[PDB]
C-alpha cells in the first residue's frame, strides 16, 4: 500500500525521470510505489 509521504516521492521520482536525472534505483522504486497507489485504483475518466 501507499502513504502521503510515498506518493510524495513518487511525485518526487517523476520529476526526476521528466527531468532526466532519475538513477536506475530511483526508477526501480518509482514504478514499484506507482503499483503500490494503483492499488484498487481505477480510471474515473472512462469508470474503467
Known sequence: ???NAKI???NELAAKAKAGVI???EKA???KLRQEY???FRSSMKLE
Open 1 to 3: 500500500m501507499i502513504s
Open 8 to 10: 510524495a516521492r513518487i
Open 23 to 25: 538513477t536506475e534505483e
Open 29 to 31: 522504486e518509482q514504478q
Open 38 to 40: 494503483l492499488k484498487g
